[PDB]
Structure 1
Amino acid sequence: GVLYVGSKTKKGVVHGVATVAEKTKEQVTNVGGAVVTGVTAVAQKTVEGAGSIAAATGFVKKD
């Protein structure tokens, strides 16, 4: 189809993703797709096919 984005802005201030740790052991920021930051930010994804798998996991501990 058609994806149409039109934007007029005088002033924009944007902070995307921040991970801050002090005296910490296991800290995970995990994003399955894309990370898009800005004034006027657009992300588009298309998957065409049978039996598609999208899997996102913080952490796995196995013993």
Structure 2
Amino acid sequence: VLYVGSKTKEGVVHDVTTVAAKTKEQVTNVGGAVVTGVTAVAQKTVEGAGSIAAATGFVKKDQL
């Protein structure tokens, strides 16, 4: 009766490897979003109306 229960991985980010030698960036930003990098987001549950989950480089401008 071994492992009668779970042995799982839910919403998992592992063994992410990155090797970026050079980024000679002249980044000019005027009222905007720029994303230059490793972004790991692991979630199990997100709920709600109008909800944003794991947004990267986002620009939200509502005339509401």
> Cα RMSD (Å) of the superposition?
11.4
More moved, 48-57 vs 31-40: 31-40
Aligned to 1:49: 48
* Count of residue correspondences: 62
More moved, 37-46 vs 18-27: 37-46
More moved, 27-36 vs 50-59: 27-36
Measure, in 1, the Cα distance between the counterparts of 2:5 and 2:21. Answer: 41
Q: Note the C-alpha offset of 1:52.
A: 1.0
Structure with higher Rg: it is: 2
Q: Higher relative CO (CA 8 A, sep ≥ 6), structure 1 or 2? A: 2
Q: Note the C-alpha offset of 1:61.
A: 14
| Runs of 5+ unmatched residues, structure 2 | none
Measure, in 2, the Cα distance between the counterparts of 1:11 and 1:48. Answer: 17
| Runs of 5+ unmatched residues, structure 1 | none
Q: Go from structure 1 to structure 2 and tell me whether the alpha carbon gap of 1:52 and 1:14 turns closer, same or farther (over 3 Å shift).
A: closer
Q: Deviations over 1:13-33 (max 9, x none)?
A: 997111212232359999999
Greater fraction of residues in strand? 1
Measure, in 2, the Cα distance between the counterparts of 1:52 and 1:11. Answer: 21
Q: Deviations over 1:25-61 (max 9, x none)?
A: 3599999999999999996511232221125225889
Measure, in 1, the Cα distance between the counterparts of 2:35 and 2:3. Answer: 17
